[PDB]
Amino acid sequence: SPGIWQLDCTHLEGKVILVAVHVASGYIEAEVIPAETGQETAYFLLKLAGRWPVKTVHTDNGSNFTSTTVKAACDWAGIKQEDGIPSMNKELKKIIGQVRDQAEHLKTAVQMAVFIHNHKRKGGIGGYSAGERIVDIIATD
Amino acid sequence: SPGIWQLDCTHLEGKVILVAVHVASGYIEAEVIPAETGQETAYFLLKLAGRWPVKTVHTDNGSNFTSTTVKAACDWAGIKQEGVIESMNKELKKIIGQVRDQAEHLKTAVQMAVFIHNHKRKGGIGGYSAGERIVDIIATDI
Ligand SMILES: Oc1ccc2c(c1)OCO2
Ligand SMILES: Oc1ccc2c(c1)OCO2
Ligand SMILES: Oc1ccc2c(c1)OCO2
């Protein structure tokens, strides 16, 4: 459970946003990429796995994930790739709209949205953020 | 403090690597960029602060860090701008060379080195990696 990430793509203004969600916490990592190629996807995963302990990724089984370049990346990083195994994308586009008018470029609006999402307290003032939840869940002490 | 980072640049292959080290842990975030511009620096900072609770960043004297875009990003993100972390930097550049050949582009080699550094257990049985240390520091703070 703590090592499981869900990857999805979202398309906005003709650009591609790759989103990784840590399933247990709702914490997100996201980047605008040129296009869903095997090299860009592998690069994204390698970055993700270098920053958090990624054991398993669930993907939508897009052609970018069937590429050997992605399989090679997952192998090197020790990630179990789970293709086709079953709503951030709505939440995030919402937040992206709240900040869109503060950023010249979409890529910046995306990172602002990531920031807001991960810092937001869920479940009343007594609750916690996705950021707080992921470190609590992943901490080994 | 859990909120303190040190940022620095390294110039390699006519490229710039931006490196941020979480001071208390040795954990690193790094990106390869075409050039050390105000725009790229501000973007790097926004990404960092959205992923980890960044309170203060220590930087070099660069004109990039005082640009208006960086100031706007730091204001929005709540970031304040201002001898072993120099080591994590020489460590990283060493790992880069030890893997640089395994990869086509510099940036792949850089992210491989970040992976190796952050996952690497320090000390014997009983040791921790930098990645485990940052998570433990922040979880304890919360
Ligand atoms: O461990 C974290 C604590 C707070 C955060 C976070 C991670 O992402 C943004 O906010
Ligand atoms: O983005 C942040 C989230 C939590 C924090 C912080 C910054 O400073 C201390 O606590
Ligand atoms: O337990 C870990 C926490 C963060 C990490 C990691 C392991 O490897 C890279 O980043």
Side-chain angles (χ1 to χ4, degrees), chain A residues 1-38 40-141, chain B:
Chain A
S1 180
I4 303 177
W5 294 72
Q6 179 80 36
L7 217 154
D8 290 296
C9 62
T10 204
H11 293 267
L12 190 69
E13 297 168 28
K15 296 180 186 49
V16 192
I17 301 161
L18 205 45
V19 182
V21 180
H22 180 255
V23 176
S25 69
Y27 175 94
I28 62 170
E29 191 111 358
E31 306 249 38
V32 166
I33 57 171
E36 281 172 269
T37 70
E40 293 287 338
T41 306
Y43 186 65
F44 180 92
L45 286 163
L46 164 58
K47 281 198 286 185
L48 183 70
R51 291 153 177 68
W52 294 96
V54 179
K55 304 301 169 159
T56 305
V57 178
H58 291 154
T59 88
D60 58 18
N61 195 225
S63 65
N64 56 319
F65 296 104
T66 66
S67 70
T68 310
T69 305
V70 166
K71 290 163 164 188
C74 286
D75 282 347
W76 188 94
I79 294 172
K80 306 199 315 176
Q81 195 186 327
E82 292 178 9
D83 304 310
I85 290 89
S87 183
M88 285 299 162
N89 288 0
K90 185 163 182 175
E91 145 85 339
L92 193 69
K93 272 171 177 188
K94 176 204 73 176
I95 301 170
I96 287 171
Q98 295 173 355
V99 295
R100 192 62 179 92
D101 72 5
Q102 292 173 64
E104 312 290 303
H105 308 290
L106 177 68
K107 61 147 69 292
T108 306
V110 169
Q111 306 305 326
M112 293 176 68
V114 168
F115 178 111
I116 287 176
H117 173 84
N118 288 339
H119 281 90
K120 177 185 178 198
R121 185 165 304 169
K122 297 292 182 64
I125 199 161
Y128 296 93
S129 68
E132 289 170 327
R133 301 193 296 264
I134 189 175
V135 299
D136 182 51
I137 286 174
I138 283 179
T140 63
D141 273 332
Chain B
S1 161
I4 305 188
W5 294 73
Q6 172 144 316
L7 185 47
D8 254 289
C9 58
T10 146
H11 293 260
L12 214 116
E13 309 183 9
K15 310 252 48 195
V16 192
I17 311 169
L18 286 183
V19 186
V21 185
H22 182 258
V23 174
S25 72
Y27 174 90
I28 287 166
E29 297 257 14
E31 299 275 1
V32 178
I33 57 183
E36 215 175 333
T37 74
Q39 303 302 142
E40 293 281 11
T41 305
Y43 186 68
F44 175 98
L45 292 165
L46 282 173
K47 292 220 290 173
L48 185 62
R51 286 146 183 75
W52 296 100
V54 171
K55 169 177 173 191
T56 300
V57 173
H58 294 119
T59 76
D60 64 23
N61 45 70
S63 59
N64 56 314
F65 286 107
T66 51
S67 69
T68 60
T69 175
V70 170
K71 288 183 182 332
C74 286
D75 182 289
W76 187 83
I79 299 163
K80 178 168 187 281
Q81 307 196 52
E82 297 180 3
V84 68
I85 61 199
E86 306 181 341
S87 319
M88 308 278 136
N89 279 276
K90 295 173 285 177
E91 142 106 329
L92 197 62
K93 178 172 287 202
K94 185 171 182 163
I95 299 167
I96 288 171
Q98 302 176 2
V99 305
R100 177 60 189 90
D101 69 326
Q102 300 190 10
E104 69 312 302
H105 312 344
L106 179 57
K107 59 174 181 163
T108 293
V110 170
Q111 304 305 338
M112 292 176 58
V114 169
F115 178 107
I116 295 167
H117 172 81
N118 286 340
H119 275 92
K120 173 165 177 163
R121 190 195 75 261
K122 293 326 236 320
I125 283 186
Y128 294 92
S129 67
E132 288 161 349
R133 272 180 255 108
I134 187 170
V135 170
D136 290 336
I137 287 162
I138 294 165
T140 299
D141 189 72
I142 300 152

